[PDB]
Amino acid sequence: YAWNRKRISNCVADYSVLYNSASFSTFKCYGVSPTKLNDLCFTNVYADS
């Protein structure tokens, strides 16, 4: 109910080794494109983990 809103953005979301690791779940996302996350920067994305 009190999910976080930390603005984890304007950074580098590299996923090379992330995709290599088989234990990982899902980062090939459907928002804009699965791979548009390595050098892409985020405007005001807030983590709600």
Partner 1 sequence: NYNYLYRLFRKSNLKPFERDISTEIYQAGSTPCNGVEGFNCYFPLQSYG
Ligand X SMILES: *[C@@H]1O[C@H](CO)[C@@H](O[C@@H]2O[C@H](CO)[C@@H](O)[C@H](O)[C@H]2NC(C)=O)[C@H](O)[C@H]1NC(C)=O
Per CB under 8 A, residues contacting partner 1 are: 25-26, 28-29, 34
For position 21 contacting ligand X by CB under 6 A, the verdict is yes
Is residue 27 a contact point for ligand X (CB under 6 A)? no
Helix, strand, coil distribution of the chain in percent, nearest 5: 10, 5, 85
Least Cβ distance, residue 10 to partner 1 (angstroms): 25
Distance CA 36, CA 29 (A): 9
As measured in angstroms, the least distance from the Cβ of 26 to partner 1 is 5
The residue assigned the tokens 């807030």 is: 46
